[PDB]
């Protein structure tokens, strides 16, 4: 019920990778935006994402990687300055 990135993200992501657990955090607040600009600027710049998916099976750090950054490359275009990933297999985690 609200259009913004995260749920973009959220979208994006629950689609292709259909993950058994997604984590899209965000800590824009913590290092971007500013009051004299609020409103008027996209503030939607800092994510944190867990990933945990059957499909990154068989794949080194580097390709799943470039698989997320890959699927966020139009956010990444429009306004998401910082990502930072952990993507694991359920085998993986708890």
Known sequence: AIENRASRMR?????????VELVIE???YQHA???GM??????ETHFNVKIVSKGFEGMNLVKRHRLVYH????EL?????????VSKTPSESP
């Open 71 to 74: 699927l966020l490359r139009e």
């Open 33 to 35: 935006g500013h009051a």
């Open 11 to 19: 979208e994006k992501l629950q689609k292709e990778l259909e993950p």
């Open 77 to 85: 275009d429009t306004g998401l300055h910082a990502l930072s990933i």
């Open 38 to 43: 609020k409103g008027r600027t996209d503030d």
């Open 26 to 28: 965000d800590v824009s």
